[PDB]
Design a protein around this ligand. Structure first.
Ligand code: FES
Length: 98
């Protein structure tokens, strides 16, 4: 399957739509498609690539940084997250964790 992923940058009021395979991490697909997103560790152990789900679901089992509460709240580490449905997500939410 291939999922539709809507990337929203609230502070800049930008919107980008990409298509991501169900076996590809969101970050990678975004870059391939011409949209550079923030990252650091690229390994699910940091907050740099954090986003916030608006709608849809993802699989981020490879993540280690977020706690249960933050996940329930909708936070996602885009560097290690695979879409599991069409998704709408707010990017650049790193500073929401401090
Ligand atoms: S860049 Fe560190 S968890 Fe994604």
């Amino acid at each position: 399957a291939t999922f539709k992923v809507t990337l929203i940058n609230e502070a800049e009021g930008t919107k980008h739509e990409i298509e991501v395979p169900d076996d590809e991490y969101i970050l990678d697909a975004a870059e391939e498609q011409g949209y550079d997103l923030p990252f650091s560790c690229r390994a699910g152990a940091c907050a740099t690539c954090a986003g916030k789900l608006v709608s849809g679901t993802v699989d981020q089992s490879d993540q280690s940084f977020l706690d249960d509460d933050q996940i329930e709240a909708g936070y996602v580490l885009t560097c290690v997250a695979y879409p599991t449905s069409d998704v709408v997500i707010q990017t650049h939410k790193e500073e929401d964790l401090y």
